[PDB]
Design an enzyme around this catalytic site. Structure first.
Site, short mmCIF file in Angstrom:
data_model
loop_
_atom_site.label_atom_id
_atom_site.label_comp_id
_atom_site.label_asym_id
_atom_site.label_seq_id
_atom_site.Cartn_x
_atom_site.Cartn_y
_atom_site.Cartn_z
N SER A 145 48.84 36.21 36.89
CA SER A 145 48.17 35.56 38.03
C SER A 145 48.82 36.05 39.31
O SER A 145 48.86 37.27 39.52
CB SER A 145 48.01 34.04 37.82
OG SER A 145 49.02 33.28 38.46
N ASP A 248 37.42 35.85 35.47
CA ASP A 248 38.68 35.14 35.65
C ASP A 248 38.47 33.82 36.39
O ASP A 248 37.78 33.77 37.41
CB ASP A 248 39.66 36.04 36.40
CG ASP A 248 41.00 35.40 36.59
OD1 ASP A 248 41.18 34.70 37.60
OD2 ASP A 248 41.86 35.58 35.71
N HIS A 294 42.08 32.45 32.16
CA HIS A 294 43.05 32.82 33.18
C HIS A 294 44.44 32.98 32.57
O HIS A 294 44.96 32.03 31.97
CB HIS A 294 43.11 31.76 34.30
CG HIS A 294 43.92 32.18 35.48
ND1 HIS A 294 43.72 33.37 36.15
CD2 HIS A 294 44.95 31.56 36.11
CE1 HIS A 294 44.58 33.47 37.14
NE2 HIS A 294 45.33 32.38 37.15
F1 LIG Z 1 42.43 35.26 46.31
C1 LIG Z 1 42.66 36.47 45.71
F2 LIG Z 1 42.67 37.41 46.69
F3 LIG Z 1 41.62 36.71 44.90
C2 LIG Z 1 44.02 36.42 44.98
C3 LIG Z 1 44.96 37.43 45.10
CL1 LIG Z 1 44.64 38.87 46.07
C4 LIG Z 1 46.19 37.37 44.46
C5 LIG Z 1 46.51 36.30 43.67
C6 LIG Z 1 45.58 35.29 43.56
N1 LIG Z 1 45.98 34.20 42.72
C7 LIG Z 1 45.23 33.50 41.89
C8 LIG Z 1 46.05 32.58 41.28
N2 LIG Z 1 47.29 32.76 41.74
N3 LIG Z 1 47.26 33.77 42.65
C9 LIG Z 1 44.35 35.34 44.19
CL2 LIG Z 1 43.18 34.03 43.97
#
Ligand SMILES: FC(F)(F)c1c(Cl)ccc(-n2ccnn2)c1Cl
Ligand SMILES: *[C@@H]1O[C@H](CO)[C@@H](O)[C@H](O)[C@H]1NC(C)=O
Length: 350
Positions: A145, A248, A294
């Protein structure tokens, strides 16, 4: 089985200024090292970080961490649970910086919180070198994640760090699980903050750092692009294996999708899976099942999912062999083509 060590350099801290750390289980006969980055979303302003400090404090502080943790999935030392790397030296790095492992900023008179994720990784690597990592042949930086995105942001910096410390023979590799996101349009618009807007705000609040080649492409003000796997991956030099569910749950959350499905949402979900599949077309080491889920790699039953009849521990073993021409019956590129969650019968049941 993994024992806590707080960082000896107490200037490298969790959000609240408490020392960061790592959990370690050594395997004295092994030159393989698995460093796993925990996930757990992020926070991007004072008000949201304050809320996270109230009800998710272990993700912001080491004050309440237990002295041990049990290694599970890819961190398990039992071959039955971990066919891939059960004999490796195991390191679990808790996520206590709320910055997708990108931050390089201390708590100070101007900062209520420290965002030190990128420096935590560097300091863990430095302190492990005196505990046996100096003898390593392979260092696999893994993560799930937010930790999966952390792998993409940091794997080449670990490689550069070891090179500059005089350890050019340690092969640094990355395993990014559930960290490969799309900066797509939400199904219904809401900042559940849109993926593009979330990262733009956080990177400024955290003093976030991105890989140098990606930074040079996107330049000032646009480094948020480097948090998106399909944009940062082509700039990376270390071998990176990408694990990503096609549907996801965190991707759907930021897209404001909540699950009888009508045509508009059906088309949205099918297009999301197709877009994800497209971004993986030229990623040679990847495992992307058509499931709504996830994370995978630290789950005890991570062995159960298969793509085209190949499990993830097998694919990772095939990857190891490929890094010694394709291997007969030992594939490394495994992306589902069926277009709806659970069209793969081996998807997690929930
Ligand atoms: F918002 C996003 F851009 F899609 C993103 C990114 Cl780049 C990196 C980590 C997450 N994330 C999801 C759960 N924990 N971290 C998310 Cl949700
Ligand atoms: C402690 O960490 C900080 C921040 O990464 C670094 O500037 C400093 O050199 C480190 N100290 C030692 C003794 O390694």
């Amino acid at each position: 089985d993994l024992r806590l060590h707080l960082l000896l350099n107490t200037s490298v801290t969790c959000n609240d200024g408490s020392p960061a750390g790592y959990y370690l289980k050594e395997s004295r006969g092994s030159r393989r090292w698995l460093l796993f980055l925990e996930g757990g979303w992020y926070c991007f302003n004072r008000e949201n970080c304050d809320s996270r400090y109230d009800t998710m404090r272990r993700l912001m502080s080491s004050r309440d961490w237990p002295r041990t943790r049990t290694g599970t999935g890819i961190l398990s030392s039992q071959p039955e649970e971990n066919p891939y790397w059960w004999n490796a030296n195991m390191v679990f790095i808790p996520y206590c910086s709320s910055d997708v492992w990108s931050g390089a900023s201390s708590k100070s008179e101007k900062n209520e919180y420290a965002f030190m994720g990128a420096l935590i990784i560097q300091e863990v690597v430095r302190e492990l070198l005196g505990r046996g990592l100096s003898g390593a042949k392979v260092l696999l930086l893994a993560g799930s994640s937010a930790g999966g995105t952390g792998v993409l942001l940091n794997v080449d910096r670990v490689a550069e760090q070891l090179e500059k410390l005089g350890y050019p023979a340690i092969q640094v590799r990355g395993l990014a699980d559930s960290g490969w996101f799309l900066d797509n349009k939400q199904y219904r618009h809401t900042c559940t903050c849109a993926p593009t807007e979330a990262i733009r705000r956080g990177i400024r609040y955290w003093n976030g750092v991105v890989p140098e080649r990606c930074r040079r492409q996107f330049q000032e003000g646009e480094e948020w692009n480097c948090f998106f796997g399909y944009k940062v991956y082509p700039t990376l030099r270390s071998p990176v294996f990408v694990v990503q569910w096609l549907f996801d749950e965190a991707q759907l959350t930021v897209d404001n999708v909540h699950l009888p499905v009508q045509e508009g949402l059906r088309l949205y979900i099918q297009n999301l899976g197709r877009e994800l599949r497209h971004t993986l077309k030229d990623v040679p080491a990847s495992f992307a099942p058509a499931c709504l889920s996830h994370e995978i790699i630290i789950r005890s039953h991570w062995t159960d999912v298969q793509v085209k009849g190949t499990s993830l521990p097998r694919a990772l073993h095939c990857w190891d062999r490929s890094l010694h021409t394709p291997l007969k019956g030992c594939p490394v590129h495994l992306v589902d083509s069926c277009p709806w969650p659970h069209c793969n019968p081996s998807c997690p049941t929930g």
